[PDB]
Amino acid sequence: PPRPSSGELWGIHLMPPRILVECLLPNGMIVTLECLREATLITIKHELFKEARKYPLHQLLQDESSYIFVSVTQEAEREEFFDETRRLCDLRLFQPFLKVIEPVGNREEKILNREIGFAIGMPVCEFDMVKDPEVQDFRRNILNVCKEAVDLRDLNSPHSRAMYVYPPNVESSPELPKHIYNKLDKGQIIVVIWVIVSPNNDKQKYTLKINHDCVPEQVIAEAIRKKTRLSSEQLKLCVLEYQGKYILKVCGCDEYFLEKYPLSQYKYIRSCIMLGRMPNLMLMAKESLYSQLPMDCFTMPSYSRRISSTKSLWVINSALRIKILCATYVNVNIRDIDKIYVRTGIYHGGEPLCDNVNTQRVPCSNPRWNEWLNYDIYIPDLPRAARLCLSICSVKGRKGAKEEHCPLAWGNINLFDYTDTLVSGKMALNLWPVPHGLEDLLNPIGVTGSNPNKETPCLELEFDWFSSVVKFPDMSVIEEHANWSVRENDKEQLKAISTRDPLSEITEQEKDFLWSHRHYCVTIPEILPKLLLSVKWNSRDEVAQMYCLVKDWPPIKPEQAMELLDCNYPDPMVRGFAVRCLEKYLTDDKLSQYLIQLVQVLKYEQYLDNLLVRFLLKKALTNQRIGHFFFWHLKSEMHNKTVSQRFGLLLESYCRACGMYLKHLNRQVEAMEKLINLTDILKQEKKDETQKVQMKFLVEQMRRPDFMDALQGFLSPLNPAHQLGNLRLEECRIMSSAKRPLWLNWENPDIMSELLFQNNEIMFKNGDDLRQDMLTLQIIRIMENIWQNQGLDLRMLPYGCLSIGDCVGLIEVVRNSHTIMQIQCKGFNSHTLHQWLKDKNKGEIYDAAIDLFTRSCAGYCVATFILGIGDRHNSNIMVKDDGQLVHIDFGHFLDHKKKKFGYKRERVPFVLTQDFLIVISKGAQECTKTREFERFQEMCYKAYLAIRQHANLFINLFSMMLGSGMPELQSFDDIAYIRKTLALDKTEQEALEYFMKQMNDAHHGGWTTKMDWIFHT
Amino acid sequence: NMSLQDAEWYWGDISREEVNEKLRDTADGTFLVRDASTDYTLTLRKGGNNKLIKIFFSDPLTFSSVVELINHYRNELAQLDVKLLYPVSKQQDQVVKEDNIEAVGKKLHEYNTQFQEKSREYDRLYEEYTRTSQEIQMKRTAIEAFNETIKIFEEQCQTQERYSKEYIEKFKREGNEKEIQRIMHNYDKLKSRISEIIDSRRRLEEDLKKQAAEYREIDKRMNSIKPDLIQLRKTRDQYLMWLTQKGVRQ
């Protein structure tokens, strides 16, 4: 099973310096050997075999080299220790012992399965045990994706290997916004190219001036020309013909310019132009990189070599009926509730296909019904994605006529299996606990399948029998049934419906209209989500026709196809169409930008094997930047039993084909396990000890060779292009906050670290759920991108944040930043903030600081209002010395105060205090009357309307995250908040009036508009 | 068409989300009319879904008023195949049983106090529920690891037995007392250790039986608070709405 802790033994976080180890010799003898906690297995084996001579039957023992050790791990697995260089403290032993064995079987397979199992945080052998033929089919059938990916990697070796390991960090389009292009000197960029003139490793700079759209080779060519020598024009041209033997690298990190894209399309360069900063690049030989790249080999696993009448659904002439037999138990106080019943529904997504049907009410102590439930649905009319959603509810009818109904346990089942067979006969289903905050009696958004924990309420069911196996009809049979089923102001009406947000109201009249004009709809292909909701899914006549339209449907933008992958679109044809759009039009840039949502929608998939999982796995195995985050997002959810089987099987297939990255990922995983263990000691055994005592314990344990080996020389999980070198222990500290996070600092080991950052600072936090911050930071990045592409330079500077498990993760530290409270403490007055920024930015550079402060402040003012972020104060807002504002610890979004207080109003988390106003107004008396404030308001108005125009994207992104299990994001009614803050049911002008009134109410006046009252002009 | 804004089914300036709470788990035929996002919107419950029918329904308009359009389908209604039955009435006036603003305000302060205290107890119980559930999972993994450990140590006794049987046979015939004693001493140490591992599993099995019992009791306590907490919020929210309506309105 999964490891209970990250400790060195069961119930012992850290082993004492010396420990007694029970050694089981192959002659049947037991030897107690005292070992040093960090001694390697080769040492222990040698010390044991010396000692073993002083014990009976020593003559039966072979040479020590004939044996390896085996023991039980904290995962209840008998692990064979083929790697004798590993230390005792790193073996994850359950108890202090080791059994001596002669190694047998496939050594190679066992070593790889251990490495995969270590990465995934679950033993591979657990999958071989699983009886479900769907799991065993998934494991075998997914290997074609693995083999495809690895073969595309060796296609154009070594360039194709380099392209996988170091993919180009490029924008989706080469076209630049006007305000970015105007920052250039007549379409030209000044770049600094550096050469490591080996030996002695000496640096030389070349202040080069070239066209922004120059392909990396064109940049290499100019560096060849501008080199210090003396040669003529014809001599400089022939030396340039010998080029293409070099590659461009970013100074300070592992970013490479390996593909022929305009220089300005590379995110580092684009960012450089924007910030006005000088791009520092390093020229290196193609061979220096290609030699460092190993050839990746995929091996077919052992499980691949081994093995683990029919009526159409449409010929079944009957209504749907399910027998609810009994439930083993329920946990209810018999004195507090009156009766228990089973609530059931037939769903397609989160929409019922017929009315919900309940069993009769029965006593708490006797959960037995033996009742056939009848549904108002004709069996042939069942759509392919139909599900049975049920729950055991309690009823408390004590106050008047008023009844209180609450779910006790829930479960969901696909009515058809992965092989299209309709469920038949008797079925036992283990129920799941009700998610905190969920008040609805059924949970149709929740996962399907039985609860793996069998010490839970088990509901016994019975499905109909039709003297045979019932299969859903084939496409050919569906297509023929669709044929059997068969002024221009209405063309303008369709255009208006297609522009509306995914959660805007659709009337029955609109549904009938959309369905009546389903054939003209093809002209406006983005109307497809609205049209699919108009379909009567409880009718095979309409569905068959919808399948015919979907097959020949024109492709839509990926940001629109993503909606068809959420919990509202369960149909495999609809999801298939959506996946094909992403295959064709989704760039690696955008895939990385929406990966988190794409991973969450995998949870919605009815089956393990589907087009989406195949698409995502292919991409993770074609692009290491995607692979890294694909791994960490799946790994972060491995504790969650609802999704751990699916994510574990997926992770297994990823780790089996990612090549050399498995070694780098295992280094990241073991660095994290040691940080989890260190923080667990401080939170548990050392919680009642002082900061000084905790720090002495910290410096002592961090200085251990086993700790220094694991936490130095690995890649940053926040950004794998960042190398974490030697730990700078004098900079490492425990924070005074409640969860006691670690503030860690590493050296950047890059030969040119001084041109990027010499130190990498990261916060490790154990105890807090980091998914909300993770989602908020991602939305801020998408908002800033919309703004920049529209001409608004509202710099947000969102720090990296990664959830690595259950309330555990990494938060990137923002360099040279100070909380508003830290500035206020150094001074008392409302001018203290503006005074600090004047002292930090003297003379000429003063205006740029006020401008940066104003721009960042406006971005945050609009972003926090739209999102409903956790309330702002002087301790969760920071300012950099350059003026850049950064908001930290968002924690909560949307209507998080809806239940707690009955008040219905949109909050303004970020109210600009007199102190912030004094900065923007450059120390003026009446702040709101200045030209600076007027310009700041205009930035807010522009930023707000820009996000409102892109509302469908933000609504889709939140809709895709409903699977996650974030408490503030459980239903579409939670997403209703951004529909209010973005005033989507109002006109563009009314929405701006709305935003202005919200700012006016919170700031007690001052917010005006240069535009007129009647028409905004 | 007897009344206007007096009608029990009309609700006015209330969101779709509010209507979704009012129609949740209701029988086919339940309905209410509200103001549109603009013109009104009729929301009818049919087949487990809420159906939005806009009031401008079809182009040849035979309805004189909003109350005339509703009462036409309330009595007899396919042109689909559903007639307006039970309307949601403005029942909600009964929940607040106080006359003046002072008495209502005093009762709201009481309900909100009770609600925040019950919310704090629910969250505390939920943290205990989570922690207990997590520790039960750890003990279940640790028991499996014990079973595997005990199997290995038992295998070791068997191995000791197979390999020593013929040697003890020879040493007894060769008269080596010291050699037989050294073998049985090691075997005793092995048996002493398996006894200790078995007792450790036995203790863990007891702690898990006790923590599994605590869990069921935490689950029971939460299944009792949940309905009472929801009802308390509903009351609180109803008294808040009463005060908003009774007080000076913008």
Ligand SMILES: C[C@@H]1Cn2ncc(-c3ccc(S(=O)(=O)N(C)C)cc3)c2CN1c1ccnc2[nH]ccc12
């Ligand atoms: C690691 C992140 C980002 N970040 N970047 C810089 C800092 C920072 C912290 C303290 C100070 S100080 O007050 O001047 N100092 C001298 C102590 C200055 C800067 C932080 C803090 N931060 C968090 C901390 C805790 N929970 C979080 N949840 C999401 C973000 C986050």
